[PDB]
Every structure is written in structure tokens, then in C-alpha cells.
Amino acid sequence: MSKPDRVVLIGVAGDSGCGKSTFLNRLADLFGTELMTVICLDDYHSLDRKGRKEAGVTALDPRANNFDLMYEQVKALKNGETIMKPIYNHETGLIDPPEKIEPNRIIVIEGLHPLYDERVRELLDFSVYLDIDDEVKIAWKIQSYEDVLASIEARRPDFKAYIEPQRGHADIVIRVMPTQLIPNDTERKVLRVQLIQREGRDGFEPAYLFDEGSTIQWTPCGRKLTCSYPGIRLAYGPDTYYGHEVSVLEVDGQFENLEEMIYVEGHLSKTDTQYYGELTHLLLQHKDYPGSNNGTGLFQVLTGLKMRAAYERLTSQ
Ligand SMILES: Nc1ncnc2c1ncn2[C@@H]1O[C@H](COP(=O)(O)OP(=O)(O)O)[C@@H](O)[C@H]1O
Numbered sequence: 001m002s003k004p005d006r007v008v009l010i011g012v013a014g015d016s017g018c019g020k021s022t023f024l025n026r027l028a029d030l031f032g033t034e035l036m037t038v039i040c041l042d043d044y045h046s047l048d049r050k051g052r053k054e055a056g057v058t059a060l061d062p063r064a065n066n067f068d069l070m071y072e073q074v075k076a077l078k079n080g081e082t083i084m085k086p087i088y089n090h091e092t093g094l095i096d097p098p099e100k101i102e103p104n105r106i107i108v109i110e111g112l113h114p115l116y117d118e119r120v121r122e123l124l125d126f127s128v129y130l131d132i133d134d135e136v137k138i139a140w141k142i143q144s145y146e147d148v149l150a151s152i153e154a155r156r157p158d159f160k161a162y163i164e165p166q167r168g169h170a171d172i173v174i175r176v177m178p179t180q181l182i183p184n185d186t187e188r189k190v191l192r193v194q195l196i197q198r199e200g201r202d203g204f205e206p207a208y209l210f211d212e213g214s215t216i217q218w219t220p221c222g223r224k225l226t227c228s229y230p231g232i233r234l235a236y237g238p239d240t241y242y243g244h245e246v247s248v249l250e251v252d253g254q255f256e257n258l259e260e261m262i263y264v265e266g267h268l269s270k271t272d273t274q275y276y277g278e279l280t281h282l283l284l285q286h287k288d289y290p291g292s293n294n295g296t297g298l299f300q301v302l303t304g305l306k307m308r309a310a311y312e313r314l315t316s317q
């Protein structure tokens with residue numbers, strides 16, 4: 001029967017090893033496993049692992065995915081309709097018989113091409129893109145320089161042709177970069193992280209520092225917070241990005257204790273937390289998650305808070 005329910009559709013774009021499973025685990029801390037259903041878009045591969053090898057294409061290739069079928073079932077789910085979704089088996093590399101997916105209050109589609117097809121794009125209510133510099137992405141996989149570099153060098157043509165342009169369509173881009181606080185760094189364990197927040201989505205107001213419309217460089221270490229060198233550095237300001245207006249929040253360095261975390265949170269505006277300290281609580285809820293001490297975990301939680309705010313906004317009427 002007809003319903004007043006508004007199913008909210010969310011997209012998470014990125015390659016593997018880009019913190020995507022970590023990000024989805026943090027979203028579970030905010031929504032739970034009950035009313036959120038997560039769909040790995042690899043299920044819409046048209047070619048299985050042996051098929052892609054014999055056709056000579058990677059999984060990044062659009063000719064190895066069925067966007068007609070993806071759009072059919074995502075649209076059906078958003079109409080409160082039950083679907084029979086195929087299953088891609090990452091172990092055996094095969095496309096297994098389908099399973100029954102029931103519509104939920106929140107549908108999150110995640111994978112390589114959630115923002116690639118305009119038909120699916122029009123269905124999404126909010127989206128992220130996890131952007132990892134080839135420098136940082138190389139450092140994560142290596143933690144053999146030669147063999148990894150070759151691995152990411154073979155995939156980059158497909159990546160820049162089909163994957164990277166999705167950044168222009170995301171409401172939020174989480175960009176991970178090498179640090180600027182350490183001269184000639186080798187390990188890439190300290191990270192400079194940016195939260196690129198697009199202007200345009202109807203109710204989505206960006207988190208900011210001090211003044212939402214202007215540019216600030218801020219070092220929180222001082223008379224009220226002690227840090228060891230090099231410390232923490234933050235930035236905020238308007239900018240343009242793929243021809244659209246954005247608000248960029250930035251953080252560089254590591255949090256070495258809880259006091260530095262709550263100090264930064266207390267000085268951020270419009271984080272959409274529901275109580276003072278919720279950002280720090282969620283960030284420390286899983287100490288083992290990678291990035292729990294720097295800007296990657298911080299901005300993942302912040303992005304989820306924006307999704308929660310977009311969800312509560314869409315389901316208020
Ligand atoms: N913020 C981060 N800091 C350091 N390493 C990370 C971070 N996010 C991801 N990684 C590395 O990537 C690997 C896979 O992480 P995961 O979130 O499962 O990526 P995906 O879900 O895209 O496969 C992890 O084992 C970790 O080594």
C-alpha cells in the first residue's frame with residue numbers, strides 16, 4: 001500500500017583501500033543495521049572476474065557494469081518496491097543467483113560508479129567521494145614500492161577517465177593528502193585532510209571555522225592547549241571546485257590525546273552534532289578504525305552527521 005515514508009538514498013563513491021568500509025562502519029554507528037541497508041554496486045557487474053580478464057578490462061571500466069539494471073533496481077527500491085538483486089562473489093569472482101532486497105528507510109549504494117550515471121545521480125539524496133592522493137594511496141598499500149606503484153599505475157587511466165570525474169557531482173569530497181607540517185616526509189602517516197562541501201543541496205549547510213563566508217588559518221595549539229611539534233593546523237574558506245561553489249574545511253596533523261580532539265570540536269560550527277562532544281565520542285567509539293587520530297576519521301564522522309541531518313530533514317515532512 002501507499003506510504004507517507006520517504007526512503008532516503010545515499011551514495012558513497014571510491015576505490016578500495018580508500019577507507020570505504022571504515023566509513024560505512026562509522027555510518028552504522030549513526031544509523032544502525034536496522035533501518036539502513038547497504039548495497040555494494042559490484043553486484044551490478046555485467047562481467048565476472050574471468051569475463052573481465054578475457055575481455056581485457058578492469059572493474060573500473062563502464063563496459064563491465066550494467067547501469068541499466070542498476071538504475072532499474074535503485075529506482076524500484078526508492079519507490080518502496082522489493083527487488084531481486086544479483087550478487088557478485090568477491091571470493092569466487094562469480095555472479096551468484098540473486099537475493100531479495102526489501103526497501104528500507106535509508107538505502108546506501110557504495111562502490112566505484114554511484115555518481116557515474118545521470119539516471120542514478122538524479123535519485124540520490126546525498127553523496128560522498130573518498131579522494132586519496134596517489135601519494136597517500138601508495139603509502140597505505142605499501143604499509144614494496146616498485147610493485148604497488150606499478151599496480152596503481154596500471155589502474156590510473158581507467159581511474160581518471162571513469163572514477164575521478166564523479167568528484168564534481170558529490171555533495172562532500174573527503175580528500176586525503178600528504179602533510180605540510182613535516183619537511184620531506186617518507187611514511188605518509190601524518191595526513192592533510194580536506195572536507196570539500198558543495199553548495200546547492202537544498203538543506204545542506206556546511207560546517208565551518210569562525211566565519212562561514214571567509215578564509216581562516218588556525219593553529220589551536222597555544223595558551224589553552226599544549227601540543228608537541230609539529231602539532232595540529234586547521235583551515236577553512238570558500239572556494240570553487242569543478243565550477244561549483246564549495247566550503248572547504250581542512251585539518252593537518254595528528255591528535256595525540258582527547259583534549260586536542262574536544263578542543264577542535266568545540267571550535268567548529270554547524271557540525272550537526274546533537275550534544276557537545278558527540279563528534280569526539282563517535283570518533284573514539286572505535287579506536288582501532290584507521291584514521292581515528294587524524295582528519296580522516298574526523299571528517300568521516302562529520303560527513304555522517306551531515307547525512308543524518310539530511311535524513312532528518314527529508315523525513316520531517
Ligand atoms: N584513514 C586511514 N588511515 C590509514 N590507513 C587507511 C585509512 N583508511 C583506509 N586505510 C587502509 O586501507 C585498508 C582498507 O581499508 P577499508 O576501509 O577496508 O578500505 P575499503 O573499504 O575501500 O576496502 C586498511 O587496512 C588500511 O590499511
Ligand SMILES: O=P(O)(O)OC[C@H]1O[C@H](O)[C@H](O)[C@@H](O)[C@@H]1O
Nearest residue numbers: 042049052057058059060090093
Ligand atoms: O583487476 P580488476 O578487474 O579491477 O579486479 C579487481 C577486483 O574487482 C572485483 O570487485 C573483485 O574484488 C575481484 O573479483 C577483482 O580481483
